[PDB]
Amino acid sequence: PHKFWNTQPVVQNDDSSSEYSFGPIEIEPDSFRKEIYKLPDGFSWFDCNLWDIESQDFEDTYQLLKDHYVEDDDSQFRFNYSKEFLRWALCVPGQKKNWLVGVRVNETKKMVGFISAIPIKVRIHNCIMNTSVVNFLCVHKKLRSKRLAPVLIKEITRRIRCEKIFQSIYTCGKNITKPFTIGTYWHRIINVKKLLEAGFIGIPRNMTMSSLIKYHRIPADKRIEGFRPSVDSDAEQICKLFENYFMKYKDVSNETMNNLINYDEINHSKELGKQAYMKLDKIEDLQDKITIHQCFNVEDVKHYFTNIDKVIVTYVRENKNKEITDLFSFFIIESTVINNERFPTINIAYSYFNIANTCSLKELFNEMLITAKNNNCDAFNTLDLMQNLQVIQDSKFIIGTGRLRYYVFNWKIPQISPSNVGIILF
Ligand SMILES: CCCCCCCCCCCCCC(=O)SCCNC(=O)CCNC(=O)[C@H](O)C(C)(C)COP(=O)(O)OP(=O)(O)OC[C@H]1O[C@@H](n2cnc3c(N)ncnc32)[C@H](O)[C@@H]1OP(=O)(O)O
Ligand SMILES: O=C(Nc1nccs1)c1cccc2[nH]c(-c3ccccc3N3CCNCC3)nc12
């Protein structure tokens, strides 16, 4: 039983909903708490200066996450997000200085807590809105189980609402309230020996180090020409590539995609915001289509679908007209091998956004897998989001442990398949 999440505008696990509907859970533009939340005595909030990668805040944040952020259930691996990754993930177009939220010990200046939000644009069925993604919630291990997390969550919620934004998207590797979808982790082994040394996999009794290497090999027998890293001048072409992809998989009519309800212009009024509610005749009207996804304008594309060594890899395929027709992308996160003082980290690729128009998605992922290998990634990870299950099904991906639950704050979304979701969080 929750004591915090039961009070919040989210669909609860006990939820009995007559129908599949979309829309705001509450329209409360003026009634939220505006006063800063109290921390334990001796602690203080600060706006985390991630705007200069050399700053002390950035160093403190890197250290806090390195030692206290997400681990696997068995505490064998912990994420080790680089500063360059964090800068790409958090200093996004439109970001607010006050959406990077730190907790400091006044006596020692030690940073003991962090939470962040980034602005994104999203379509949800027939509505479009500016919203927030909350990520990198982190509390020092020595401060856990003291109910600080809700304080951090309440404070970031306040700071988002001060920007006239009343919804948020977030994921969790555990069930909290009722998730609108559940993603499954899949892993493609690239560097067998490194991952054996790290304990990520073992050597089966019916196999050898060498048979294992042969089995997990990325095939090269069939390559696809025309792929190159994206550059900044591709942004307009990439942007249109995404519009086309989302138009292709829309779950509303063409007239509706072109005339989405802009929740930003109506969320100040209980009466007008009602417009955003939508009943859905049948959940099968959504089958095989995308219902919620991020929207990118050209400045977003320039930032997200770029190439930064050891952070983000974006390739596009040109046709004979030198028009961009396909795109793959993946970001790179190192993980600490918690119990291995000698080989201490592994470099993992994570599928981001992928668009196949002139090749199959399987062919695209195969080109991306080779590129990830050539980027010194030890494994390639993906979720069964969008059309990825097509690649995962008939492949050498191995299932991960646990599941990734998707949440939206203060919005109703029926429970949907992850194929219907085009939201990737870092
Ligand atoms: C309008 C805008 C809205 C924006 C807000 C949108 C919501 C954003 C939501 C946050 C999005 C996070 C997105 C990411 O970054 S997911 C990554 C989360 N980070 C980690 O797992 C890092 C390692 N772990 C930690 O640092 C701590 O364990 C954390 C800080 C996670 C919990 O610290 P601690 O273990 O000491 O717990 P507590 O005693 O203080 O408090 C327990 C209460 O807090 C709820 N809880 C615990 N963990 C989570 C969690 N991961 N999401 C949501 N709620 C969580 C819990 O249900 C319980 O409440 P209730 O069950 O009694 O009700
Ligand atoms: O250690 C871990 N993964 C390792 N893969 C190879 C060696 S170690 C790992 C540990 C905890 C949570 C994890 N979630 C995932 C993951 C897997 C596949 C697709 C997406 C994923 N996440 C990444 C973080 N944000 C949400 C989405 N991985 C991990």
Report the CATH superfamily, name and number, of domain 5-182: Gcn5-related N-acetyltransferase (GNAT) (3.40.630.30)
Counting ligand 1 atoms within 8 A of each CB, the residue from 2, 154, 172 with the most, and so the one to mutate, is: 172
164 φψ region: left (φ > 0), alpha (ψ -120 to 50), beta (else)? left
Contacts (Cβ under 8 Å, ≥6 apart) of 4: 147, 150, 153
How far is the CA of 150 from the CAs of 4, 113, 138, 154, in angstroms?
7, 12, 11, 6
Give the resolution value in Å.
2.0
186 is in an annotated binding site: no
Round to whole Å and give the CA distance between 27 and 410.
Answer: 9
Alpha carbon of 335 to ligand 2 centroid (Å): 9
Q: Quick one: 383 exposed, middle or buried, by C-beta within 10 A (0-12, 13-18, 19+)?
A: buried
CA distance 337 to 373: 20
Strands 111-124 and 168-172 turn out to be unpaired
Enumerate residues lining ligand 2, CB below 6 A.
70, 72, 77, 171, 173, 185, 187, 200, 335, 346, 348, 350, 379, 381-383, 400, 404
Residue 32 Cβ contacting ligand 1 at under 6 Å: no
Specify the experimental method.
X-ray
For atom 18 of ligand 1, the residue with the nearest CA is 137
Backbone angle region of 250, left / alpha / beta, with phi > 0 → left and psi within -120 to 50 → alpha: beta
